[PDB]
């Protein structure tokens, strides 16, 4: 497909590893630092400044302040997940609604078959086929964050022309306890 043939011509492949210091203590980051799961109960970890202590989130180890970047995430048969980018300076302690105005540009799935963008208010997406693997694409200078079905190239959603002022991290959120993890592809 053109998607596979061109992605690297146009966007720099990000090698995203999950930063265990950022991860909500209810989350487990795998040893290879590419997959996240949820525990039944919050594990015993410090409340260091980088950790999300309320939202069930985890960040990439590296952020972006320019250029064009992409990574792919195997969502598989998970019933719930959200992925995207966020500002370095988001509120990590206590609640904030996950929205562009709070520095989060995400979308995902809930209740097995409801695809949404996490805008204010949420808006529903209509996807012909459920995706298994989702590509997340950032162009910092144009302001676009776009999501594609990584297996067939079809478009899922684009946040257009955001005027970014901070560094941006990949972000991943899982609310549910299910057999299937959320996994980054290298
Ligand atoms: C409790 C929780 C997430 C749910 O947040 P919200 O209740 O704000 O809902 P959503 O529209 O899915 O963001 C932990 O990240």
UniProtKB/Swiss-Prot annotation:
One of its GO terms (cellular component) is plasma membrane. It is found in: Cell membrane. Detected on T-cells, natural killer cells, dendritic cells and macrophages (at protein level). Ubiquitous. Highly expressed in heart, pancreas and lung, Moderately expressed in placenta, liver and muscle. Residues 2-186 form the B30.2/SPRY domain. One of its GO terms (molecular function) is signaling receptor binding. N-glycosylated. GO terms for biological process: activated T cell proliferation; adaptive immune response; positive regulation of cytokine production; positive regulation of type II interferon production; regulation of cytokine production; T cell receptor signaling pathway. Residues 2-186 are cytoplasmic. Its main location: membrane. Belongs to the immunoglobulin superfamily. BTN/MOG family. Plays a role in T-cell activation and in the adaptive immune response. Regulates the proliferation of activated T-cells. Regulates the release of cytokines and IFNG by activated T-cells. Mediates the response of T-cells toward infected and transformed cells that are characterized by high levels of phosphorylated metabolites, such as isopentenyl pyrophosphate. Homodimer. This is Butyrophilin subfamily 3 member A1. It comes from Homo sapiens (Human). The gene is BTN3A1. The chain holds residues 328 to 512 of 513 of the full protein.
């Amino acid at each position: 497909g053109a998607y596979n043939e061109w992605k690297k011509a146009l966007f720099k492949p990000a090698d995203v590893i999950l930063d265990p210091k950022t991860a909500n203590p209810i989350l487990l980051v795998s040893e290879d630092q590419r997959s996240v799961q949820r525990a039944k109960e919050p594990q015993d970890l410090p409340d260091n400044p980088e950790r999300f202590n309320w939202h069930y989130c985890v960040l990439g180890c590296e952020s972006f302040i320019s250029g064009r970047h992409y990574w792919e995430v195997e969502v598989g048969d998970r019933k719930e997940w959200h992925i995207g980018v966020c500002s370095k300076n988001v509120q990590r302690k206590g609640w904030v609604k996950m929205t562009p105005e709070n520095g989060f540009w995400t979308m995902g799935l809930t209740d097995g078959n409801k695809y949404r963008t996490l805008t204010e208010p949420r808006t529903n997406l209509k996807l012909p086929k459920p995706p298994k693997k989702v590509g997340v694409f950032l162009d910092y200078e144009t302001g676009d964050i776009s999501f594609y079905n990584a297996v067939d190239g079809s478009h899922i959603h684009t946040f257009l022309d955001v005027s970014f002022s901070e560094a941006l991290y990949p972000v991943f959120r899982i609310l549910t306890l299910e057999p299937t993890a959320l996994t980054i592809c290298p």
